[PDB]
Amino acid sequence: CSLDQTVAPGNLTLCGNATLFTTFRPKARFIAPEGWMNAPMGLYQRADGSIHAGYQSHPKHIQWGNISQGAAYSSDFTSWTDFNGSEGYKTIWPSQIYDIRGVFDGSIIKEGIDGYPTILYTSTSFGPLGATLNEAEGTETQSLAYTTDDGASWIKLGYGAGQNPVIYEWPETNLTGFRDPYVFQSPRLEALLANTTSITNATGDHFATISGGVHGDGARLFLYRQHTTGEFIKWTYLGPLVTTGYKESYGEWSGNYGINFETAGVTRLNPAGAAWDNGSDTTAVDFVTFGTEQGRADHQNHWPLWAAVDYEVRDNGSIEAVIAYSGVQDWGRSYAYASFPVEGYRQVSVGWIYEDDDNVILAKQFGYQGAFTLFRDLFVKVVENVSPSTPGLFEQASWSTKNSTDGMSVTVTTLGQRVVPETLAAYKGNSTVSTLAPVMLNESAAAYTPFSSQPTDRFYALTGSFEFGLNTTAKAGFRVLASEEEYTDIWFDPASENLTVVRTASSLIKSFGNDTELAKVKLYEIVGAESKTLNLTVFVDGSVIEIYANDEVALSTRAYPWLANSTGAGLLADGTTAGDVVGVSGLELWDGLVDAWPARPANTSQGLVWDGPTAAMYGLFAGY
Amino acid sequence: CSLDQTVAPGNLTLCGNATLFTTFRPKARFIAPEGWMNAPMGLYQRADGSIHAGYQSHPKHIQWGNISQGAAYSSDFTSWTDFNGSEGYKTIWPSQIYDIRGVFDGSIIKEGIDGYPTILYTSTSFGPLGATLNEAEGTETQSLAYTTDDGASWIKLGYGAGQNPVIYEWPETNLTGFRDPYVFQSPRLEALLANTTSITNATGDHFATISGGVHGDGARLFLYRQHTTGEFIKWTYLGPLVTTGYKESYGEWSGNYGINFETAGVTRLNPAGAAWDNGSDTTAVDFVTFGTEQGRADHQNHWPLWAAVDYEVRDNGSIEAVIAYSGVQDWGRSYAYASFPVEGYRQVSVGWIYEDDDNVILAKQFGYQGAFTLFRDLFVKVVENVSPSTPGLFEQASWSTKNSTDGMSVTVTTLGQRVVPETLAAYKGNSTVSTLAPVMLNESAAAYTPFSSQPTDRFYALTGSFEFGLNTTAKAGFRVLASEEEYTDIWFDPASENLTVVRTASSLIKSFGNDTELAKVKLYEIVGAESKTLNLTVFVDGSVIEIYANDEVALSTRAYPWLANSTGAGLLADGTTAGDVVGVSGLELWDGLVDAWPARPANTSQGLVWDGPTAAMYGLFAGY
Ligand SMILES: *[C@@H]1O[C@H](CO)[C@@H](O[C@@H]2O[C@H](CO)[C@@H](O[C@@H]3O[C@H](CO[C@H]4O[C@H](CO[C@H]5O[C@H](CO)[C@@H](O)[C@H](O)[C@@H]5O[C@H]5O[C@H](CO)[C@@H](O)[C@H](O)[C@@H]5O)[C@@H](O)[C@H](O[C@H]5O[C@H](CO)[C@@H](O)[C@H](O)[C@@H]5O)[C@@H]4O)[C@@H](O)[C@H](O[C@H]4O[C@H](CO)[C@@H](O)[C@H](O)[C@@H]4O[C@H]4O[C@H](CO)[C@@H](O)[C@H](O)[C@@H]4O[C@H]4O[C@H](CO)[C@@H](O)[C@H](O)[C@@H]4O)[C@@H]3O)[C@H](O)[C@H]2NC(C)=O)[C@H](O)[C@H]1NC(C)=O
Ligand SMILES: *[C@@H]1O[C@H](CO)[C@@H](O[C@@H]2O[C@H](CO)[C@@H](O[C@@H]3O[C@H](CO[C@H]4O[C@H](CO[C@H]5O[C@H](CO)[C@@H](O)[C@H](O)[C@@H]5O[C@H]5O[C@H](CO)[C@@H](O)[C@H](O)[C@@H]5O)[C@@H](O)[C@H](O[C@H]5O[C@H](CO)[C@@H](O)[C@H](O)[C@@H]5O)[C@@H]4O)[C@@H](O)[C@H](O[C@H]4O[C@H](CO)[C@@H](O)[C@H](O)[C@@H]4O[C@H]4O[C@H](CO)[C@@H](O)[C@H](O)[C@@H]4O[C@H]4O[C@H](CO)[C@@H](O)[C@H](O)[C@@H]4O)[C@@H]3O)[C@H](O)[C@H]2NC(C)=O)[C@H](O)[C@H]1NC(C)=O
Ligand SMILES: *[C@@H]1O[C@H](CO)[C@@H](O[C@@H]2O[C@H](CO)[C@@H](O[C@@H]3O[C@H](CO[C@H]4O[C@H](CO)[C@@H](O)[C@H](O[C@H]5O[C@H](CO)[C@@H](O)[C@H](O)[C@@H]5O)[C@@H]4O)[C@@H](O)[C@H](O[C@H]4O[C@H](CO)[C@@H](O)[C@H](O)[C@@H]4O[C@H]4O[C@H](CO)[C@@H](O)[C@H](O)[C@@H]4O)[C@@H]3O)[C@H](O)[C@H]2NC(C)=O)[C@H](O)[C@H]1NC(C)=O
Ligand SMILES: *[C@@H]1O[C@H](CO)[C@@H](O[C@@H]2O[C@H](CO)[C@@H](O[C@@H]3O[C@H](CO[C@H]4O[C@H](CO)[C@@H](O)[C@H](O[C@H]5O[C@H](CO)[C@@H](O)[C@H](O)[C@@H]5O)[C@@H]4O)[C@@H](O)[C@H](O[C@H]4O[C@H](CO)[C@@H](O)[C@H](O)[C@@H]4O[C@H]4O[C@H](CO)[C@@H](O)[C@H](O)[C@@H]4O)[C@@H]3O)[C@H](O)[C@H]2NC(C)=O)[C@H](O)[C@H]1NC(C)=O
Ligand SMILES: *[C@@H]1O[C@H](CO)[C@@H](O[C@@H]2O[C@H](CO)[C@@H](O)[C@H](O)[C@H]2NC(C)=O)[C@H](O)[C@H]1NC(C)=O
Ligand SMILES: *[C@@H]1O[C@H](CO)[C@@H](O)[C@H](O)[C@H]1NC(C)=O
Ligand SMILES: *[C@@H]1O[C@H](CO)[C@@H](O)[C@H](O)[C@H]1NC(C)=O
Ligand SMILES: *[C@@H]1O[C@H](CO)[C@@H](O)[C@H](O)[C@H]1NC(C)=O
Ligand SMILES: *[C@@H]1O[C@H](CO)[C@@H](O)[C@H](O)[C@H]1NC(C)=O
Ligand SMILES: *[C@@H]1O[C@H](CO)[C@@H](O)[C@H](O)[C@H]1NC(C)=O
Ligand SMILES: *[C@@H]1O[C@H](CO)[C@@H](O)[C@H](O)[C@H]1NC(C)=O
Ligand SMILES: *[C@@H]1O[C@H](CO)[C@@H](O)[C@H](O)[C@H]1NC(C)=O
Ligand SMILES: *[C@@H]1O[C@H](CO)[C@@H](O)[C@H](O)[C@H]1NC(C)=O
Ligand SMILES: *[C@@H]1O[C@H](CO)[C@@H](O)[C@H](O)[C@H]1NC(C)=O
Ligand SMILES: *[C@@H]1O[C@H](CO)[C@@H](O)[C@H](O)[C@H]1NC(C)=O
Ligand SMILES: *[C@@H]1O[C@H](CO)[C@@H](O)[C@H](O)[C@H]1NC(C)=O
Ligand SMILES: *[C@@H]1O[C@H](CO)[C@@H](O)[C@H](O)[C@H]1NC(C)=O
């Protein structure tokens, strides 16, 4: 195994375990110390203002199994410190008959058992488990644990009647899934249900959704309400909150609802961030975020979606969330988005970016799999003075429109997402910042124009505002992780409304994915404007490429160039002419970002292990 | 619920949990503090000379489940002290994917991992488990744990390749069972295999048997040998040690071999006790003790058996234990006998006495189920100068015969069992001892004759020597736990060779078992004698009646009389006449015995719990 990155890669499958640990590894984001990670979980702001982040974790392995909560904390979403206890960085693990098959996703009751932060999580036991299998009741249940030391450790309630698991009865038969309890307070839902509490007897101040579906009949989000305030054992099933059809799609801008939901959450937002009103704020909108499975031919059959909803109260004292419009939270290789409340009326969302090595060819050589996305503030994005001639505006696909009184302008509303400002400030302050001169891409533009200042490594950010003619057929964007022989091209094509990431040349290593990523982006044209603008921001972090457009569209992907000099960046131009000009301004490069794990050495591998021949006998985990 | 024991019992099923805790409870023997217990396990003599005894335990329940090792220690087999740790009196419990379904029986390697006492135990996981079910490989495996604090706690080896479980591959297909590893040293087997170690490469000083069988083709005891001395991960399968046929019986004196073995062990004995020679001691005999299942219509389909064996070395470097003669370790409501070595060339055996409430009618009201037998020294019983006219002598059923040179006398050899002398000494010393006058049972004998001194409670022992004519048709024995209305009759009938316990009047409470117990007893007639003698000893301990005859035959049973005065005892006589006289001598009553758990209060119930609706969903444990 040669690690010479000045020549073509050899047969890297001959390399030992974790020999490629640092080669492609993100440095500026949340990632486990080593091994397998997937979904964020147990997210909460602690009493001291710091953020506790959990994650689905399988240390010393590179496939899923014995799934546990790994955890860490941060005062700024950006620089993190691992917990370190008797199980290393794990804080909850399989240990009881009810959760021995895995401690799945869970969420936080901030004032729970004996006043302590309390997690409600999916406790899994034996049996077929999956949306395409014949799962039975008991295999997935919901259980409680609480922490007396701010997340350093958790104490589970005892196993038994009136204790764990606390939710085990399936609310409907033939479920495709029954997991990922999302606990939340909602003045909105309390106000809506206040006249029906005699029907259900559920009067608690916490609600919980559980994600699943029904075999042959689409996904379901099930709503529960805490039966009594200050008591956490009894949760009353109200009814289905979200019901979608088997592989139903709301359209091209909205992914596909698949057969089963995962990691669903409920929030309420206004233009500033989180909204805690009862319905009285006319600018606030109710949202559900959710993953779907088996409604996609690629991306591990997974869509991370969101929908704006209008709540209706049913006669039996339950809530129907009627979908008003429906979108995509991230168009790339990410899934399992979780959101949580943060001080200052914020709702912050973070997901999991998987690798692009689906045949598991170099996973052992990495010695790890997975990272988080960046942490994102959610809010209601409002665009005023939108021109009615904006193409496709009244499809109202992943947005709503409200006409002005005179019908000559429109107010557009949709889900906004932006990187938390703490991370942007820390990144900028720790980076070498180059402000670049604006450029007109015209007849003289090369296909690729390197920036006047170049990155020094695979840890950087770039931004630019691309101004297009209203009838342009030109394409423009950014090339990143670029040498002569390897590069990744991020294009926007206003005529098709497609943002693409072309990865045919991303790496000389052929075992990594090289399919083109695609997001839809609606450029809302402004009344009186003779152009339309795309604000495009890209974070490059080891192998992660994380793209944001107009504080609305997000696309996370992976590129694994071998060569040490495949770090360059610049502007892309196609079909720009003297008449069809793309103006690029507000150009800036941040080289370096932040070391997100300052206490960790460069190599935190502890080696990899095999579970042995019993892994195949039990049939639960791959075993490596 | 009335607890008035001076009048007839009411409907005792209306009584609360553990309200009958003290009513029928043994006081003078090993028993858990509360709840369910079954098989002894993890038996060893510690470095300080004390005895560590483990047991299959389910606290706060009255049926089997979450099965764990409860433990205690004693300096004299008789007075015990519970361990007390983070899990109360438990010291090993289900905690890993490989043992989450139960920590089954295991045995001790005295100098094991890092020189510490080490247990090899059956670690169970999910799936059908049972001799009549379709069990699969992995459901029962064998795992190691070691203790650094003399049994107060145990540390399991890690889960994985080259660690736990250490034995998982089935040695043959379609096993009925694969459990109860019995680890032992054997100079005998080492000497027999010494010329074959090139064939197998197994040269360790520990052997282990695993108990099971093959579907449709009878029971099997599988022999393993430690691959290398001082190393405890690798155990090499040699071959089947004992092979018996599907529901095969060696005859009337030998029970039935059933379909599957449980709790099998291997030992070597001589007339004094344990034998540690290599084969050179011509007085020593190799024995296997084992439980069988599904070869009996009653007694929970369970026979606790033993066999004398002659070892043959196979060409593949394995051992066939050929059965020479075959007997019964206890004829009553006991099972799961374990034996272990004790200083002074002793092998000590102890089993589990189950209740006689198979429909679980009063188990909750008890608040516990089960006890141990007394601890028994094993040895080779030798009877010299036996008359060849002893009826049925040359059937050689559960004994062997060796003729004298002149053919006029016989030496009989069989398995001897007697209560450990420490217990007999402690019982006698703490009791009020009444030595009773000898009696001739003749034409004037009443059916029942109370002893001149009577017990004061349900904790006593009695012994007597019954001398019969060689052609007697008289019956005699002992009545115990007796008032006018309730009593239990222990009869010997030399003409049929049957020792019986008639329990039709044992209790006014009709839900307890009342079937007649039966053991075969061979009175070996001595050359020149004009009579034959039965030495009969009975221990009465709460509800336990434990009977020993001629240091050979054992019969454990249960009687639950309601009335407070159903404690009396005396002699039974049937068909005694002027011509057919039974002489009774050596009569002695010990009233009181010993408080075996001096630190425990009278009521050690902690209440009972229900596992809740998930117990039925998981399908592993009853849940109560
Ligand atoms: C199969 O069998 C299994 C084994 O038996 C079984 O699992 C066990 O289940 C039981 C029962 O559910 C569990 O017992 C509970 O334990 C809770 C604490 O759990 C944490 O701590 C224990 C013990 O920790 C000590 O020991 C360990 C090991 O040595 C050390 O590491 C620790 O440092 C600590 O050591 C100190 O103490 C020792 C003595 O105990 C000393 O020896 C030592 O020197 C130290 O000083 C840990 O073992 C636990 O770890 C395990 O679990 C975690 C997850 O939780 C895993 O991550 C980990 O790997 C382990 O598996 C864990 O860390 C107790 O809190 C709990 O007791 C409460 O609940 C019951 C009711 O259900 C009450 O009876 C009891 O009174 C307690 O309730 C009171 O207190 C709580 C909290 O304060 C209140 O909320 C509650 O209202 C109540 O308050 C009352 O009192 C107040 C005043 O005090 C009053 O104001 C109130 O009004 C009120 O009256 C219970 O004991 C046990 O942990 C399980 N063990 C394991 C190993 O899993 C399994 O379920 C079985 N399976 C089946 C299918 O049946
Ligand atoms: C799913 O995930 C699960 C969770 O991750 C996973 O289970 C875990 O598996 C791991 C890996 O197998 C287990 O880790 C092992 O733990 C052994 C010790 O186990 C005992 O102690 C721990 C820790 O105890 C501390 O913390 C608890 C909890 O707070 C306290 O109660 C204790 O008092 C104690 O507290 C002190 O220390 C803390 C810090 O650690 C402090 O915070 C605290 O303040 C105190 O000071 C317990 O948690 C264990 O309890 C659990 O298990 C028992 C059964 O064992 C249950 O009954 C119980 O309920 C719990 O479930 C337990 O009591 C370690 O010995 C072991 O490390 C050895 O092995 C590995 C190799 O496999 C080596 O890397 C390592 O070096 C060690 O080997 C050396 O040492 C041994 C023994 O000394 C030697 O034999 C060996 O040769 C070697 O020697 C070397 O060094 C010598 C010099 O030192 C040298 O001379 C030699 O030459 C040689 O080089 C390992 O860490 C972990 O316990 C499991 N945890 C649980 C909760 O189950 C599960 O498997 C996963 N499932 C799947 C399917 O994957
Ligand atoms: C004395 O000890 C016991 C422990 O043994 C303590 O706990 C009780 O344990 C018994 C079992 O011994 C439980 O009985 C079972 O109850 C089931 C129905 O439960 C619901 O109703 C009761 C009655 O009002 C409620 O109290 C329960 O509430 C508790 O549980 C819920 C969770 O569901 C918690 O949220 C609460 O907080 C409580 O903890 C429940 O709401 C019932 O299904 C079950 O029925 C079987 O058994 C009976 C009798 O044999 C049959 O009539 C019936 O047909 C079922 O029989 C089954 O038999 C076989 C084998 O099981 C199966 O193959 C068959 O198909 C069939 O299903 C049973 O009655 C009791 O619920 C439980 N009580 C608790 C936890 O409070 C006592 O508390 C303790 N007493 C004291 C004072 O300490
Ligand atoms: C680098 O990290 C790894 C952890 O990932 C460490 O451990 C190794 O892990 C790999 C898996 O990643 C193990 O590979 C598997 O080995 C099986 C055969 O094992 C036996 O042979 C090897 C080779 O000589 C021995 O080393 C083993 O000894 C160890 O295990 C025994 C217990 O059996 C212990 O007692 C010892 O002490 C050792 O610990 C064994 O004797 C093999 O069956 C398995 O095969 C699958 O995978 C390969 C490749 O994909 C296929 O060719 C094959 O067809 C099988 O594919 C399966 O694929 C799917 C999904 O699994 C199934 O559905 C199919 O039906 C099919 O079965 C695999 O090759 C390796 O054994 C293990 N090594 C150990 C523990 O030593 C490394 O140690 C670590 N390296 C370092 C230097 O630290
Ligand atoms: C019944 O018990 C008696 C008394 O223990 C046994 O007779 C004794 O046997 C020993 C050992 O051979 C002798 O040393 C004693 O002299 C005998 N004592 C007597 C006759 O009082 C007798 O062997 C036992 N019988 C059976 C059939 O087990
Ligand atoms: C980058 O590295 C490759 C391989 O060493 C080399 O061919 C190329 O000229 C280097 N320089 C660039 C792309 O500027
Ligand atoms: C990282 O550390 C692991 C564990 O010690 C080691 O096996 C591996 O070779 C190291 N990799 C690198 C790139 O240093
Ligand atoms: C309430 O009504 C809805 C709509 O029919 C139904 O799906 C839900 O199950 C009901 N809730 C109950 C029965 O608790
Ligand atoms: C909204 O405005 C557009 C453009 O003027 C018009 O076509 C449409 O009918 C208006 N909708 C409503 C509800 O008035
Ligand atoms: C660099 O990043 C750290 C960690 O996030 C942050 O606290 C610090 O303020 C940053 N440095 C600046 C802004 O100069
Ligand atoms: C075309 O673009 C280049 C580079 O921005 C610029 O120098 C030139 O002035 C542009 N042409 C016109 C006509 O503006
Ligand atoms: C024993 O008790 C019962 C019921 O109280 C009584 O009838 C009998 O006379 C008592 N005395 C005996 C059997 O000596
Ligand atoms: C024994 O103690 C248990 C637990 O406190 C109690 O429920 C039961 O009534 C007691 N039984 C007796 C006979 O004292
Ligand atoms: C050794 O031979 C016996 C008799 O055929 C057989 O049952 C056993 O499995 C053999 N041992 C092996 C193959 O290890
Ligand atoms: C043993 O002795 C009996 C009685 O004398 C006789 O019938 C039998 O044949 C003898 N057995 C042998 C092997 O000599
Ligand atoms: C009573 O029993 C205890 C406990 O077994 C024992 O140590 C003691 O010696 C006995 N008392 C005597 C023989 O007087
Ligand atoms: C018959 O038995 C009684 C009681 O033991 C005794 O008094 C009497 O002497 C016996 N008869 C003969 C003839 O020995």
Ligand SMILES: *[C@@H]1O[C@H](CO)[C@@H](O)[C@H](O)[C@H]1NC(C)=O
């Ligand atoms: C003695 O026991 C046997 C069972 O081994 C039985 O067949 C026989 O009928 C019994 N006879 C008497 C008289 O009890």
Ligand SMILES: OC[C@H]1O[C@](O)(CO)[C@@H](O)[C@@H]1O
């Ligand atoms: O690791 C298991 C967890 O990951 C998910 O499948 C999302 O991909 C969740 O539904 C589950 O809780």
Ligand SMILES: OC[C@H]1O[C@](O)(CO)[C@@H](O)[C@@H]1O
């Ligand atoms: O409790 C389970 C244990 O009990 C037995 O079944 C004996 O009755 C053993 O074979 C097993 O190890």
